[PDB]
RNA sequence: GAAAGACCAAGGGUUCCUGCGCAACGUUAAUCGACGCAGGGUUAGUCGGUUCCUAAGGCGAGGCUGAAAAGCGUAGUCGAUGGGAAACAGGUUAAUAUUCCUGUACUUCUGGUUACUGCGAUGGAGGGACGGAGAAGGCUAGGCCAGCUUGGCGUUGGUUGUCCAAGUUUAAGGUGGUAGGCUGAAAUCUUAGGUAAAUCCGGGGUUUCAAGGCCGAGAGCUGAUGACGAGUCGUCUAGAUGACGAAGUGGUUGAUGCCAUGCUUCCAAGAAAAGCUUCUAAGCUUCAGGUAACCAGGAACCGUACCCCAAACCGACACAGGUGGUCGGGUAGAGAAUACCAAGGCGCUUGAGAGAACUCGGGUGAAGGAACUAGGCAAAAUGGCACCGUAACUUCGGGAGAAGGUGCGCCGGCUAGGGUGAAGGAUUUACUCCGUAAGCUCUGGCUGGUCGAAGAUACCAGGCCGCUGCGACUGUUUAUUAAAAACACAGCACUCUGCAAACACGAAAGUGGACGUAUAGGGUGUGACGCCUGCCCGGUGCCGGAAGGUUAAUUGAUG
């Protein structure tokens, strides 16, 4: 973490997260594939998500979320930057050639881990089924379906806490504060995800947003009654309506989860 | 003072060309109207 | 074909440029059929005029467009070969 | 004259050239024309396209979905603005030329013959293959000076000279492998990987050694005792042509070009696929196939004229407009600004007078110096480089070029270096070091003298200061009356969303969100920063809560 000096009016509030353990250039090319931007647009060509546009050209890195290779020890070659995540990625050389990218845990460096059915549950980085990990141990990159790959707790500095095992299931507490019943056969990696100081950075200027591929956000009250329900009015108005989406859904408090297939898997909501 | 017609033969032939009209149902009936009126060109 | 030797060459193009070129170099400008490759108007000159051809160059010519009453009319786009020969050996 | 010059793409489509013409077109006349009539002109293995390959996106066998029409999509196969062979100089004209001619190359294919021979895929690896910025350096084009050749000897002083003018050219490619950049190299043993295999790549172990290797400008030599060359001689009609044709060297300054897809650095983390190198599979009968040599032969089709800071494109016009990319000389200059010019191009298709008011675009202006006016609007002013000096306030970066002041041209005198360069001395004996000297070029420092009213003398080129309102700032907007205090913004907070996410577009399939996963993603309000952000839950919404009343379809008792 470094703070830039106000030598120009745009650098005054840039707070920059700098890591020198990250690898200087040249990502491992057989694990990269092409990725072109969407603009937030559909196969109808329609904007279906506002405020996406521009940014830097990025290769997609083939991050392994499954950790299939059981009983093959993989040393960590290096830890790299990934444009399309907030975390960092570790490059793992398995004991039989076989380089793969994973999500890096804390303790990123050239050490060793072996994703398997039984091995070293105090090493942050070993991936296991949720049956044979202890209760109370912090995990990340949890599968929801066996063989689907990691889906939960995989942003920068994110983790879940395993709280109770019973039956074919196991309960773990998520970073959002909600208790989730997850299957016991599905897997998780011991530890906590790498770039945990990501939340301390300040972009600093209007154009550090635009080179993330985020187009500006124009408010509802700045518009006309044709454009938004928050709409017109003489002078500054206040959106005399209750606050609302551009499509008319209420904004400030109204619950929108209507799944009802998976309600039994959720044993405690965000409270 | 840039004007509204900026010519390109490729954009010409791909928006209004023969095969573009005969790709869709409505362009095929553009050609059948424009052939029923008896026009000399019918693909402009 | 046994034919197509008699169909490709359409006559010597007569002009001042063709005349000075036939005198100075050994190159004879023939009007040829509008789909004639360089080797089938090399075999035809070797077949019909009994010479040895060393090179043929070609060029499509756009027919000119004349204005009158009832609009623009176009002349036929035609084709033109230059037949380089050995430095003796002038064809007839 | 960073174009009003030369050129490429697009777009146009004969406007190009030559004869004949002048009705109409040309804002006038026209013998002229981008106009009329008729002829001619566009030459490619190498320049562009096709062909090979793919991006966005399209279409899409079957397939999922949809009243129908159709939508979306897998295999696929189109799709360049990107990637894949190779030609350069000189001649030639009315008009084409990297295309024709001449000379010298280069790349790739086909058919042969010779010899030894593991060939083989789309499949595996390799490679192609790539960001922003910032720099050293090393060269080269080009520039300039000197020498050399040829001509000259000046309409008015001088000009045989230490004078003037012109010219002092030569490409690709071969050979060279240099400055420089990256890099461990070889042998052997093994192997849970690269969805089969693999002698290839990846992984592991062992042994020896320090220089291999792979790139890579440019100089040199060769291309080239050739072409080009001021001109001479000769023929003939002031010129067209044949032969001959002088000098053709050295020093400096040098790029925005090349080494260089290099190197350093930073986050925003920087195309695919083929050609190419390599590996085996299925097979071959291991003739075929491969690999070198040699010989003969080939490289299709299409575009090429002309216009592109435009009278030929887009603007109804021969219209002060617009239109992508490339080159870029001298002197002054930081400069591609600007001024005068070179090569080159042009006099903008109505002129002649005249010299009123008024109108426009300028020049100067007595004495005042904003009294003008809604308002210093306009104008006038300031304007550079070096040095000195510079306030409040401040987020410590600023403010600040604050404010203000001094020097500036020319010619000498004396004096400090820098860079090229090399007479010779070293040995790893040559594209090498060291280092003399001149010559060339680049900066000083100090003192004089001197001319003008005036020395950043022209063009060029900040006016400044003091209170305050608003918005933190850079940015955006009402194409064509509003550029702002409006929008955006970093930052902030609320709220939703556990993944087949909330949400959006879709009668749906599907797709975006996202190949992301709560430090994530949507919505909303506020708008850097500093100090803060008080009271109210009645209304309305949102969230939760019992379970009492009410309550719909559906039930169908009873009368």
Automatic annotation (TrEMBL), chain A:
Keywords: Metal-binding, Ribonucleoprotein, Ribosomal protein, RNA-binding, rRNA-binding. Residues 32-52, 221-271 are annotated as: Disordered. Residues 122-250 form the Large ribosomal subunit protein uL2 C-terminal domain. SMART domains: Ribosomal_L2, Ribosomal_L2_C. GO terms for molecular function: rRNA binding; structural constituent of ribosome; transferase activity. GO terms for biological process: cytoplasmic translation. One of its GO terms (cellular component) is large ribosomal subunit. Residues 40-116 form the Large ribosomal subunit protein uL2 RNA-binding domain. Mg(2+) binds at residue 51. Part of the 50S ribosomal subunit. Forms a bridge to the 30S subunit in the 70S ribosome. One of the primary rRNA binding proteins. Required for association of the 30S and 50S subunits to form the 70S ribosome, for tRNA binding and peptide bond formation. It has been suggested to have peptidyltransferase activity; this is somewhat controversial. Makes several contacts with the 16S rRNA in the 70S ribosome. Belongs to the universal ribosomal protein uL2 family. This is Large ribosomal subunit protein uL2. It comes from Pseudomonas aeruginosa.
UniProtKB/TrEMBL annotation, chain B:
GO terms for biological process: translation. One of its GO terms (cellular component) is ribonucleoprotein complex. It comes from the Bacteria. Belongs to the bacterial ribosomal protein bL34 family. It comes from Pseudomonas aeruginosa. Keywords: Ribonucleoprotein, Ribosomal protein. Residues 24-44 are annotated as: Disordered. Residues 31-44 have a biased composition (Basic residues). GO terms for molecular function: structural constituent of ribosome. PROSITE patterns: RIBOSOMAL_L34. This is Large ribosomal subunit protein bL34.
Automatic annotation (TrEMBL), chain C:
One of its GO terms (cellular component) is ribosome. One of its GO terms (biological process) is translation. Keywords: Ribonucleoprotein, Ribosomal protein, RNA-binding, rRNA-binding. Signal peptide: none annotated. The keyword tRNA processing does not apply. InterPro entries: Nucleotide-bd_a/b_plait_sf (IPR012677), Ribosomal_uL23-like (IPR013025), Ribosomal_uL23/eL15/eS24_sf (IPR012678). The keyword RNA-binding applies. GO terms for molecular function: rRNA binding; structural constituent of ribosome. PANTHER family: 60S RIBOSOMAL PROTEIN L23A. One of the early assembly proteins it binds 23S rRNA. One of the proteins that surrounds the polypeptide exit tunnel on the outside of the ribosome. Forms the main docking site for trigger factor binding to the ribosome. Part of the 50S ribosomal subunit. Contacts protein L29, and trigger factor when it is bound to the ribosome. Belongs to the universal ribosomal protein uL23 family. This is Large ribosomal subunit protein uL23. The gene is rplW.
């Amino acid at each position: 973490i470094v703070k830039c000096k106000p030598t120009s009016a745009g650098r005054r509030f840039v707070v920059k997260v700098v890591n020198q353990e990250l690898h200087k250039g040249a990502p491992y090319a057989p694990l990269l594939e092409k990725k072109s931007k969407s603009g937030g647009r559909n196969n109808n060509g329609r904007i279906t998500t506002r405020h996406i546009g521009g940014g830097h050209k990025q290769h997609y890195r083939l991050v392994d979320f499954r950790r299939n290779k059981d009983g093959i020890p993989a040393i960590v070659e290096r830890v790299e930057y990934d444009p399309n995540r907030t975390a960092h990625i570790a490059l793992l050389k398995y004991a039989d050639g076989e380089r793969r990218y994973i999500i890096a845990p804390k303790g990123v460096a050239a050490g060793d881990q072996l994703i398997s059915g039984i091995g070293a549950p105090i090493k942050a980085g070993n991936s296991m089924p949720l049956r044979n990990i202890p209760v109370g141990s912090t995990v990340h990159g949890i599968e929801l379906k066996p063989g689907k790959g990691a889906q939960i707790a995989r942003s920068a500095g994110a983790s879940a806490q395993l709280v109770a095992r019973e039956g074919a299931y196991v309960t773990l507490r998520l970073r959002s504060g909600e208790m989730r019943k997850v299957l016991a056969e599905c897997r998780a990696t011991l530890g906590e995800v790498s770039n945990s100081e990501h939340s301390l950075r300040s972009l600093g200027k209007a154009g550090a947003t635009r080179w993330r591929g985020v187009r500006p956000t124009v408010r509802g009250v700045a518009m006309n009654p044709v454009d938004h329900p928050h709409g017109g009015g003489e002078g500054r108005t206040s959106a005399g309506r209750h606050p609302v989406s551009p499509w008319g859904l209420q904004t400030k408090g109204k619950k929108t989860r209507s799944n009802k297939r998976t309600d039994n898997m959720i044993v405690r909501r965000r409270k | 003072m840039k004007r509204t017609f900026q010519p390109s033969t490729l954009k010409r032939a791909r928006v209004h060309g023969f095969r573009a009209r005969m790709a869709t149902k409505n362009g095929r009936q553009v050609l059948s109207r424009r052939r029923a009126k008896g026009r000399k060109r019918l693909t402009v | 074909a046994a034919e197509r030797v008699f169909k490709v060459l359409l006559g010597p193009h007569i002009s001042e440029k063709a005349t000075g070129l036939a005198d100075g170099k050994s190159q004879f400008v023939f009007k040829v059929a509008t789909d004639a490759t360089k080797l089938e108007i090399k075999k035809a000159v070797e077949s019909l005029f009994s010479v040895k051809v060393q090179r043929v160059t070609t060029l499509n010519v756009k027919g000119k467009t004349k204005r009158t009453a009832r609009g623009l009319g176009k002349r036929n786009d035609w084709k033109k070969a230059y037949i380089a020969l050995q430095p003796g050996q002038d064809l007839d």
